[PDB]
Every structure is written in C-alpha cells, then in structure tokens.
Design a protein around this ligand. Structure first.
Ligand SMILES: [Zn+2]
Ligand SMILES: [Zn+2]
Ligand SMILES: [Zn+2]
Ligand SMILES: [Zn+2]
Ligand SMILES: [Zn+2]
Lengths: 383, 196, 371, 112, 302, 21
C-alpha cells in the first residue's frame, strides 16, 4: 500500500564491492586456438561467381546498427568487394538489391571491382524501403549465374535483414532449381534466424547448416563479411574438374594512346592478348575479342595459400626446455611471463612450428598465418 | 482500430474458426506460411481445438503470445457446482482450483512450442495476474523463468526477446553440449558407472 | 522456359524494347546489324546475359499482400492509388476486377468507379470491416455482394482438401462421435445478437483466413513424410562434412628453354677470413672515376627509357577532332565486334557453321579494306 | 542406441539420448517393477513419446510376460504421432535385431 | 620527412660466391659487396637521425640476423674486435662492428660444417623473415609513421639456375609487401642477366630491379638506384629496366607458358593437355569431354 | 537523332515481319 518515494534510498554506491588475470585471459586465448585446430587442406573452388544480394527494404530503416542498417551494410559491402577482389582476383561478382518487392540488378557479373564500387556508391545515396522478395532475388541470381561455366563455382551471398519475405510464387521450387543448378547460397542474417533462409542454406550447401550466419555486433559483422572472401570447400560429389584454357598477356608499353578492345577508348598502357593480340584495359578479364580468360601469374599466385594452408603454430609447454631466448623470424626476446608470483615461465609466448620446430612470438604467429602464408623456419630448413 | 492492418505488413493473420475443417485449413496454411518464410500469426483459444494435440515445433512456434490467463467463465453454474463439490469432498479451494485449471491450460499452451533441445522460442504471458502464479507453473518453465521477468512491461520484453533471438541464432558450441545437455552412448555408460 | 538462350534470341519485341531503352548500344547496333550486315541473332548471341537481365527486370512481380489493408484514407480525405496497387487489388480480389470489366468501358469511367467502390459495402467487407446496415454503400457496387459471396463459396471448393492426420483437427472432434457432454457456454461459442442470430464477427475471421489461404495458394502454381516431420533432428547424428581433400605434388619439372670443390671452398672461405681480419678498409668502395662514368651512363639510360615510358601512363585527350575520333571509334567498335564473332565461330569447332566462318572472314577482309 | 537398464536391454532409436529421457526410463522401469500408478512430468520438447515407446516395447519384448501396452492419448492427432514414433522405433528395432519380430501395433479411432 | 626501416636481405652463399669468384678475374668479392653494403647502410643511417637498419644473411643452412645481435647474444656478451676503425661515428661504428662480427661468426659456422652441402636455397625464407621483422618494427611503433623498404642482395654467378620451389614463397612475400606498402629492391650480382621471380618481386611491389656483373663500383649503384627512400618513391622514377612478362612456367615441361591450361582445383599451369587425362600436381581425373572440346581443331571450309 | 533511329528500327522490324510473311 506504500509508494515508491517512501521506500528506502537505493544506495547505489554501496552496491559497488571491490593476480591470475593473465591465466583468465590465456584460457580464453587457448579456447580461441582450440577452434582453429581443425586445419585441413579442403579443396576450395578458386574461380567463383558470387552474387551479392543486398537487402534494401524497410528493415534497413532500423537504426539498431549505427547509424542505420543500410549505410553500414553498403560500407561493409564496399570493404567486402575490395577484400574479395584482393583475395579472389579471378572470381567474378554481381550485385543485386531487393526493393519494393522487386529484385533490382545494379551491376552485371564482372571481374572489375571498380564497377561494383561505383554501383554501391550509387546505391548508398537512395533511401531503402519496401518489402523484400527472396524468391525474386534468387530467381535473378539464378538467371545471372546461368552463363557461368561449370569450372567456376556458382555462389550467392545474401545480406538479408528482414524477418519475413513476400514471394510472387513458390520459393521451394526456386530452392530446388538452385540445388539442381549447383548454386551454394550463404545468407548473412541481421535480426534473427529465419527458417526459409536456414532451409535454403542447408539445401544449397549439401546439408550444411553452418552457412546461415547471424551477427552479434559491429565486430561480428566485420568478421562475417571477412569470412565470405575465402573460397568455400567444395563437395566430394562434385566431378567438374576441368582444365581452364587461359592466357597470360604481356604488359604492352606505348607512349601513344590506342583503342582498347574492351571499352573502345584511348588507353596508353594495356595488355596484348596472347591468343588474338587484342589489348585490354585491366586484368583479370575475359578477352573481348576471343573469349579467353586473361590473367597474370600474380592472379594465380594469390590463391595457393587457400589450396595448402599453414598448419597452426603450437603453443610451447611451460616446462619444456626452450630452444631460443628470442624470436626466430622476428628476434623479439621472449619475456619471463610470470603471470603470478610462482608462475615462472607459465604460458611462454613461443609458438613452435610443426615442421621446422622453430619458435615464434605472438606478432609472428598472427602475421605468418594472416598476411604472410609461409613459415620462414620451414623455408630456412635445408631439405 | 487498424492494429491488424499493421500486422498484415509482416505476418499473415489466421484465426481458429469454430468449424473444425476451416480450422485445419487455417492451421496447415499457418504451417505453410511459416515454412516458406512469409511469416504467419495464429490466433487460437487456449482451451480450444488447436491448444490440444497440435504442436508448434521450431519454425511453427518461436513465440507463444498468451493474451491473459485462460480462466473459465466463473459464474457458470456447472463450474460453480464442481467447485463446491471439490471443496466439500477434497478440501480444494475454489480460487486454488480455478488458478490450477487456468494455469494448466496455460502450461499446455506453452508446452507446444518446443521439440528437441535445439528448438527455441519465447513464452510471453500478457496479464497482470501471472506474476503471482510463478509457482503454479511446471517446474521446468519455472526454472526457465527468471525473477527479473515477473513484472515486465512491453518494451523491455520486446528488447529481451530481440536479444534472445539474436543470441540463439548463433551456432551453439558442440563442446558446450557434448555430455551435459545431450548424451552419446559413452556418456550414458559413464553416467551409469557414476551412479553405482 | 522463357529464359533459355534461343527464347531470348527469338524474342524480337524484347530486343526492340531493350534497344529503345538503351542509348549507348545503338551506336554498335545500327552500325553492325544494319550498316555492316551482321545477323541480329549473332549480335544478341554474345549479349544473352544482357537480354536475360532486361527480361528479369520487367518479368518479375511483387508478392501478394493485403493491398486493401494498406489502402486507408490519408472534410476531404484523399488516397493514393498506384498502378501496382490496382493490379494487386485485381489479383487478390477477382470480384473487383469482375466489377471493373463490365462497368468501366460500359457505364462510367475508372476514377468514378474507384470513388464508388471505396464508398461501397463491398470494400468494407473485403477489408475485413464489420458491415453495418446504417452505411449507405454504393448501389452499383453492392449488386455484386451476393455474387461476391458466391465467389467466397467457390473459393472454399478448391481450398478444402483432406489433410494429414498430424494436424487433422476435424478428426479430433470426430474421434468420439457419440459424446454428449455438457454444452459449452457462450464464452466458448461465437457471439450472437439479441435474437440469437450471428453478429457477423466470425465472418471477418473466415474472410481473413480465406485471404491468407488465397495468398498461400497463389504461390502454389507453375511459377512417409510424417516420419521425417516427427523425427528429432537434434538426437540424430551431427552433420558430417564431405568436403574433398587434396594432396599436391611439388616435384615440378625444372625450367627449360662447373661445381666447386670443397678444397677451394675452404680456401676461399679462409681468404675471406684473413681479408676480414687484416683490414676492412671501407675507403676502397670509391670507384676510380672511370667505371663510375659507365655506371652513371647505364643508370641514366635506364631512367630515360623508364621515364619516356612513364611520362604519360575517363579516356585520355586526343589530337583528333571529335568527328574523326568518333568515326575511328565506331570503326574500331564494329571491327572488334566482327572479330569477336569470327573468333567465336572459329573456336566453336563445328563443321556445320563453317559457312558462317567464311562469311565472317570475308567481313574481316572488308574491315581491313575499310581501315 | 542400445543400452541396458538393470537387466532390461533398451533399443533407443537415436544415436544420442537426453539425460532426462534416461531418468524417465529409469523411473518407468522402477514403477513397472514395483507395479503401481505413477505421475511423471518430463519437460516438453524432450522426447517423451519416443522414450515411453522405447522403454515399453523393450519391457514387453525382453520380459517374458509380453504385457500389452495401452497408450491412451487425448486426441486422434496425438494418436497418429505416437503411431509414427512407434513405426520409427520398430524400424530401428528391425534394423538392429536384423529381423521383424512378431509384433502388432494399431491405432483405434471412430468410423469417420 | 618520415624515417624508414631498411631491411637488407643479403644472400651470402659460399658456393654461389665461390662460383662468382671463379667466373670473374678477382677473388674474395664477398668482402667487396660487404663493404659496399656497410657504406650503403651508413648512408641510410645518415639520411635521417631516426631511421633503422636490419640485415639478414641467407646462408646455406638457414638464416641468421646480422644487425641487431640476438638478445641472448647481447645478454651473454663484449670482445670488441678491431675490424672497423674506432675513430668513425659511433652510430655508424656500432652497426658496422656488429655486422662484421656477425659475418665472422656466420663464416666460422660455414667453415665448421662445410662438408654438408644443401641444395635448398634460403633466399625466400630470409625475405619472409625480413618481412616479419618489418611487421614487428611497424607494429611496435616506437617511432611513429615509420616507413619500410626491403633490399635484397643476391648473386646468381651462372651456376644456380632458376629454382621452382621458391616460386610460391616469393609470391607470398610479394603480396605481404604489397599489403604493407613495403617496396622490395633486388640487386643481382651474377652472369645470368634475368631472374624472373625477383624481377616480378620488384615490379609488383613497386621496387627497383638492378642486375650487375662486377662487384666493383657497387656503392655507386646502391647510393644512386637503391637509395630511393619510401617517402620519395612516387616523385622519383625507377631505373628498373627489362620489364618482366609476369608469366609462369609449365608444370611438366618447364617452359614459359603461352596460352595454356590450368587445373581448376590446384591451379597448376600446364602448357599442354597432361597424359592420362589426369592432373599431374593434383591427381584429379579430368573429364574426357571437356578436354576433347579443348583438343578440338578450329573450323574452315575446304 | 533518336526519332530517326526509332524509324530505322521500325523499318527493320517491318522488314523482319515481311520476312516471316
Ligand atoms: Zn578498355
Ligand atoms: Zn584474345
Ligand atoms: Zn617474432
Ligand atoms: Zn615452420
Ligand atoms: Zn590439379
């Protein structure tokens, strides 16, 4: 029968009540390293045709992601285009947006990331609205991935934000058609786990339920976007192992501008086609005059690290006799790392490699596995 | 008042008709609309045909919006006579029996949302009188019901539901559930040996 | 279906509409297909993805939705009627299209028809509103009310079908057919008027259930399971990945178009030993003012080559006037198109189309003569 | 899986088992050995029906009495669901034992 | 403007340098290239007060940092040998003395186990170690906005041919350097005019390639062409002549590839259809239909 | 001019229609 004011004061300052912290950090670090133990050389389709389906409906007007959903999805898609064409140069990409119940194609499937960047910049200014259509987007992705050759893997990335979708027709027929066309769909949901997206990811990825990814915050969204630049591991049942006829053009040098064969504009430089001697603007592109894939050796060179990955470096035992006092490829001295008073050399920062048995620091552990992709100890080994 | 017009923008509205055939058509329409991701809402009686037998597993559940405690019509003569008989013959109080019957109907409404420990779904109870009836829930629902949720308003209930649906949209850790939530044969053998 | 390559090639009207819509491709088209005699089928053969994109830009339609629920007023009140709103009204409600066909070209114009329809009881019934006799309705539109109820009765004909026993709620009440228990009270029953007749609030429930069923069955077009449904997928074994693993052989062949002994090895190493011990005179690095001339000449010549190459590396400016530059550009464009078609037919490898290869070779010779 | 409770082999038709299910079989087997009435409340979501059917079929087959099992449900739809779970259980038992034993299981409803 | 890190990757292979000495008229060219490198490092440290120097030697049996010394070696040590005169600048003197002391230690190690001959050149491993050191110094950021530059001193001597096993590590180093905006400059002192992998390294990572044949006058080349500071890279043109074609070699024949066929799985480059319709590096059975399409002769009327 | 371009395409369509005729 009383009131809120007549109750006793909250005393919030009294509620605040006040070394083994390194161990508490290193157990989480080891759990993070535990999830990276399953490193295997799965065969991955290097040549990809990724259709990026972006939601541009009324669900993007929600400001639960700063500043609104649509603006940062466009920015993260720009960063994803840059990273995808950096790590998968040969792969082509097309961008499709969903708006007002109609799937809209904004850039054709092309190997030039600049066109997709310009298209995303053009979409960034308009306000998203409408009611999304997963079936229209999937049908247009099916139409765009139809002329993709059999060696090139057909993939669809959907940044889906709404929780419900409206389809002009049956969506299970579209799912069956996508399965029959060997199209793998990975959906990055925004709000919650939609059942149709989970079923689509499960059916299109041969019973794999791990291709439906839902973010948690900003950092999880960035990690999920950076997870999609890696080529997907193909199935054993796929038997489309075909030789790809392609040429390596020589970079022509000329001070006189000449007409390119791809855009019919005056270009100083270029690359003369090794088969039909028609110059192109940028690489890697198909030849506009003889329909041959024209790439460089560096474009192939970017993708062996997916074909064979580095085995993850093993944390050294604390009681094990350390070989060196400093790093191998880095020569940073390993400190005492006394986590507590009697910790002594607990969780020593050396990272032994499984082949050369060479010790590396944390910076070398996160550099040799990420930016480099080769162990300097394994190459210094005189086999 | 135009609430349902706003509902039609997101989910299809399907209502339990008194006709059993039209109710079955509405229910299979609800399941079809939940399957393809159109999204659907089913309005049913907590003591009706849909409340008994029909299960809402995985996509067919995800939310049990309970509008109020399903009490019976109190001043019906049959119910009053039964209450008097229960009081005189088994010393069961009339309010206690009414609360028990309404709470067991509410519980059987809440039990239809789950099938398997991989399944998830919220159970929201929209009445002021559920708050005292936490002990009359089944034991497992009582364990699932935190004490801070006993007097929620709409807004933080919505925020908690959004956080929950974001939380278990994430893939669970198999190491977190290998032998504590689901057992293999080896886990069963280990527990059998630990019991003796 | 209609999205196959030959269907897009034979689609003359869609190609003409794409030509009308686009502007930059007309310079290629009117100079190659018409002015150069290239067959249009060959021209659209290489632009099949463009034709598919233009087909899918207009062939797709929005999903069905409660369009009449979205239609709300805003004394004067106004409502915006989109064309797709009219189409969705016709598709979701065939009664409105039926009343539209026999009235708009016959008696009164279309805006008058929609003004009559929004003031009618048929609109309130189709919107799920409870119908009251005090409302005036519209006398022209309300003649279809009985025929609208006939359409509602006909809609139950193809919607009613036997269901699975898992969700057979009809058979649940028929499990005991001779049950004669206490009659449920008025709370468990639909509402009634003072006379005991139905108050019509169940009619709007049946109407919205019918609308939901119509939306769902609209998806069902050309555009043992109980065991699978009742199985607990969590208790089954986890999904095992079947991803192919690869093992790579690194024993590649060597690139194709005076070994030293250990004694002189050790002699040279000891020579470096004594030469590092006795004196490392760093002043010896200075050239003798003659080899430095040659080194500077080599470096400056390399710089001259690179800088003349990299002096000049949106298209660049041209010394040509715009007329001659554009003529050279369109001649280059039609030459590149002819070359692409010739190479496609040349590397196709079919003996049946060698006459096309001969014609394209003659066209390439004519392109050389034109150049 | 296949496991043993006291002396009763149980053929659970799933490779994995919930702990609440195993406690449920333990309590039902204790009740049937004692021979009284019992009220058991598993949480919903867990496989109550499959646990009941698995233990009761195992008790009927392995123990020599072959006591009949009266599975009284509340609706015909739940009767059909129990029949589907029983069909899956007997398919698993036929697969594991290599033969289909002499067994009869039927659902009873009205003429309609 | 901004200081830079000069990480020098010198490949002191005793067999390669012995063959270079035998090909040339002079002997002991390691001393000449080492003193030219020391003067060049002194010039780089004279360019700015805050710039740093890294030197990694790629010898026969691994790699070894030459400057700075190992932290265990610093803690154990100091027998100051008198290879360099003590009257020079102390900032230069410490670097020069440490470099020549580690050269003597590494050459004593080479003499100690010269009986063991290894065919595995460790230039790419030293390049990777230099890139990791560049990453360490850049991420440490004790000096803010510190640029970086790799200098690779290698010798071909006409004895060691192009090594196919180095291709993937050199390309990985290229992409790491391009990601980190670290130019890789390569100086080749040998009879073989072209080194295709190192030329691609210089071209892709905005470096300078410079092939020389005489170790005399090398400090002029280093102070003229190799002294392009990372701050002044865009305003200074590079004298790297001999533009590389950015091609590769066939897997089973070894020749430089024309229009060719690559495996869709392991991306191995084949100049011809492999025998047995199977991938050589990958062991993937190619379909006979698609390779019959590739083997199809072009069409012409009679 | 866009109008004479549309006239040329209409004449080409008429020629095609005569070709089927
Ligand atoms: Zn171009
Ligand atoms: Zn070409
Ligand atoms: Zn390190
Ligand atoms: Zn290693
Ligand atoms: Zn291969």
């Amino acid at each position: 029968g009383g009131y809120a004011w007549e109750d006793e004061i909250k005393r919030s300052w009294d509620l605040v009540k006040v070394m083994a912290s390194l161990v508490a950090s290193i157990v989480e670090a080891r759990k993070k390293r535990t999830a990276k133990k399953n490193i295997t050389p799965y065969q991955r389709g290097i040549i990809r045709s990724l259709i990026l389906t972006l939601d541009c409906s009324e669900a993007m007007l929600e400001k639960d992601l700063r500043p609104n959903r649509h603006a940062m999805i466009i920015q993260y898609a720009i960063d994803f285009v840059h990273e995808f064409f950096d790590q998968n140069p040969i792969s082509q990409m097309g961008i499709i947006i969903m708006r007002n119940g109609l799937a809209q194609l904004v850039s054709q499937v092309s190997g030039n990331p600049q066109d997709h960047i310009d298209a995303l910049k053009s979409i960034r200014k308009q306000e998203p609205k409408g009611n999304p259509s997963l079936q229209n987007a999937l049908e247009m992705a099916r139409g765009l991935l139809l002329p993709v050759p059999a060696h090139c893997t057909r993939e669809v990335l959907i940044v889906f934000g709404s929780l419900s979708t409206t389809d002009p027709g049956d969506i299970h027929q579209t799912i069956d058609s996508l399965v029959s066309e060997k199209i793998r769909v990975k959906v990055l949901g925004l709000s919650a786990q939609v059942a149709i997206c989970k079923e689509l990811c499960k059916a299109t990825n041969y019973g794999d339920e791990s291709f439906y990814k839902i973010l948690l915050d900003e950092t999880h969204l960035k990690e999920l976007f950076n997870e999609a630049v890696t080529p997907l591991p193909v199935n054993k049942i796929n038997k489309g192992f075909t030789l790809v006829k392609m040429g390596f053009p020589t970079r022509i040098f000329e001070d006189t501008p000449t007409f390119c064969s791809c855009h019919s504009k005056l270009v100083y430089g270029g690359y003369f086609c090794p088969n039909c001697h028609s110059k192109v603007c940028s690489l890697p592109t198909v030849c506009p005059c003889c329909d041959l894939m024209l790439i460089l050796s560096t474009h192939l060179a970017r993708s062996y690290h997916h074909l064979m990955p580095l085995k993850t470096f093993a944390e050294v035992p604390t009681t094990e006799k350390f070989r060196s006092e400093d790093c191998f490829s880095c020569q940073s001295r390993f400190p005492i790392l006394k986590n507590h008073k009697n910790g002594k050399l607990l969780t020593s920062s050396r990272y032994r490699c499984e082949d050369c048995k060479q010790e590396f620091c944390v910076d070398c552990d996160v550099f040799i596995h990420e930016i480099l992709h080769n162990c300097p100890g394994c190459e210094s080994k005189p086999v | 008042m135009g609430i349902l017009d706003e509902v039609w923008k997101h989910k299809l509205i399907l209502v339990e008709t008194p006709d059993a055939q039209e109710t079955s058509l509405a229910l299979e329409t609800y399941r079809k609309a939940c399957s393809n991701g159109r999204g659907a809402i089913l309005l049913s009686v907590a003591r009706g045909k849909v409340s008994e037998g029909i299960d809402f597993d995985h996509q067919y559940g995800r939310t049990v919006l309970m509008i109020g405690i399903p009490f019976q019509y109190t001043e019906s003569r049959i119910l009053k006579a039964r209450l008097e008989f229960m009081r005189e013959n088994y010393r069961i109080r009339e309010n206690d029996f009414l609360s028990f019957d309404a709470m067991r109907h509410a519980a059987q409404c809440l039990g239809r949302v789950l099938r398997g420990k991989d399944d998830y779904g919220v159970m929201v109870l929209a009445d002021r009188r559920f708050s005292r009836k936490r002990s009359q829930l089944p034991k497992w629902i009582a364990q699932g019901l935190s004490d801070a949720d006993l007097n929620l308003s709409t807004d933080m209930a919505i925020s908690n539901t959004k956080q929950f649906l974001r939380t278990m949209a994430q893939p669970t850790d198999p190491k977190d559930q290998e032998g504590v939530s689901v057992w293999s044969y080896e886990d069963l053998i280990k527990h059998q040996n630990s019991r003796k | 279906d209609s999205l196959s390559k030959e269907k897009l090639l034979t689609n003359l009207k869609l190609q003409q509409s794409l030509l009308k819509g686009n502007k930059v491709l007309m310079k290629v088209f009117q100079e190659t297909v018409i002015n150069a005699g290239l067959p249009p089928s060959e021209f659209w053969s290489t632009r099949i993805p463009l034709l598919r994109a233009f087909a899918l830009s207009t062939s797709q339609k929005v999903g069905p939705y409660n369009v009449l629920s979205t239609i709300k007023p805003v004394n004067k009140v106004n409502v915006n009627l989109s064309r797709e709103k009219i189409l969705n009204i016709f598709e979701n409600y065939p009664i409105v299209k039926k009343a539209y066909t026999d009235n708009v070209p016959k008696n009164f114009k279309e805006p008058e028809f929609w003004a009559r329809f929004f003031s009618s009881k048929l609109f309130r019934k189709l919107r799920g509103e409870k119908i009251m006799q005090n409302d005036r309705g519209d006398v022209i539109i309300d003649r279809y009310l009985t025929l609208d109820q006939e359409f509602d009765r006909k809609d139950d004909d193809m919607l009613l079908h036997p269901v699975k026993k898992i969700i057979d709620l009809d058979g649940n009440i028929q499990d005991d057919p001779v049950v004669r228990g206490n009659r449920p009270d008025f709370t468990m029953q639909p509402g009634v008027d003072i006379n005991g007749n139905s108050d019509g609030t169940v009619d709007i429930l049946k109407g919205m259930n019918r609308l939901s069923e119509k939306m769902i069955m609209a998806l069902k077009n050309e555009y043992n399971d109980e065991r699978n449904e009742l199985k607990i997928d969590d208790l089954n074994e986890s999904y095992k990945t079947n991803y192919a693993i690869i093992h790579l052989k690194r024993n590649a062949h060597e690139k194709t178009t005076l070994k030293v002994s250990n004694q002189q090895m050790l002699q040279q190493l000891s020579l470096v030993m004594d030469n590092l011990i006795n004196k490392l005179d760093l002043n010896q690095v200075v050239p003798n003012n003659e080899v430095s001339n040659k080194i500077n000449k080599r470096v400056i010549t390399a710089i001259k080559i690179n800088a003349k190459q990299a002096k000049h590396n949106l298209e660049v400016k041209s010394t040509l006037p715009i007329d001659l530059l554009e003529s050279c550009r369109m001649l280059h464009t039609t030459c590149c198109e002819f070359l692409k078609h010739f190479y496609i037919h040349f590397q196709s490898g079919e003996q049946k189309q060698a006459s096309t290869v001969k014609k394209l070779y003659n066209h390439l010779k004519d392109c050389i003569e034109k150049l | 899986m296949k496991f043993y409770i006291d002396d009763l082999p149980v053929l659970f038709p799933y490779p994995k088992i919930y702990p609440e299910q195993y406690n449920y079989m333990c309590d039902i087997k204790k009740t049937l050995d004692v021979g009284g009435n019992s009220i058991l409340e598993m949480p919903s979501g867990t496989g109550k029906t499959v646990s009941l059917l698995s233990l009761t079929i195992a008790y009927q087959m392995h123990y020599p009495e072959h006591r009949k099992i009266i599975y009284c449900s509340r609706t015909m739809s739940e009767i059909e669901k129990a029949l589907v779970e029983l069909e899956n259980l007997m398919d698993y038992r036929t697969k594991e034992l290599g033969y289909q034993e002499d067994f009869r299981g039927l659902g009873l409803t009205s003429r309609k | 403007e901004s200081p830079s890190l000069l990480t020098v990757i010198i490949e002191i292979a005793p067999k390669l340098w012995t063959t270079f000495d035998e090909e040339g008229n002079e002997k002991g060219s390691i001393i000449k290239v080492l003193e030219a490198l020391i003067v060049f490092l002194n010039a780089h440290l004279a360019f700015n007060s805050a710039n740093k120097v890294a030197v990694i030697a790629a010898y026969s049996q691994g790699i070894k940092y030459l400057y700075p010394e190992s932290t265990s070696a610093l803690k154990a040590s100091r027998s100051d040998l008198k290879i360099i005169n003590s009257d020079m600048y102390r900032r230069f003197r410490n670097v020069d003395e440490t470099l020549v002391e580690e050269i003597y230690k590494l050459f004593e190690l080479e003499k100690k186990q010269i009986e063991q001959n290894s065919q595995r050149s460790t230039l790419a491993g030293a390049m990777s170690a230099g890139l990791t050191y560049v990453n360490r110094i850049s991420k440490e950021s004790v000096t803010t906005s510190l640029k970086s530059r790799l200098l690779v001193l290698t010798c071909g001597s006409g004895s060691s041919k192009d090594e196919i096993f180095q291709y993937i590590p050199i390309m990985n180093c290229i992409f790491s350097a391009t990601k980190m905006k670290c130019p890789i400059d390569v100086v080749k002192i040998g009879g073989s005019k072209e080194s295709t992998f190192l030329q691609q390294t210089t071209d892709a990572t905005n470096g300078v390639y410079l092939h020389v044949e005489s170790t005399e006058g090398l400090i002029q080349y280093l102070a003229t062409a190799m002294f392009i500071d990372p701050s002044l890279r865009p305003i200074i043109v590079k004298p790297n002549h001999g533009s590389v074609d950015f091609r590769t070699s066939c897997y089973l024949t070894g020749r430089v590839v024309a229009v060719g066929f690559i495996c869709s799985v392991c991306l191995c480059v084949l100049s011809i259809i492999p025998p047995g319709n199977k991938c050589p590096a990958c062991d993937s059975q190619f379909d006979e239909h698609v390779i019959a399409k590739l083997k199809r002769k072009p069409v012409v009327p009679r | 001019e866009e109008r004479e371009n549309e006239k040329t395409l209409n004449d080409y369509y008429a020629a095609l229609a005569k070709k089927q005729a």
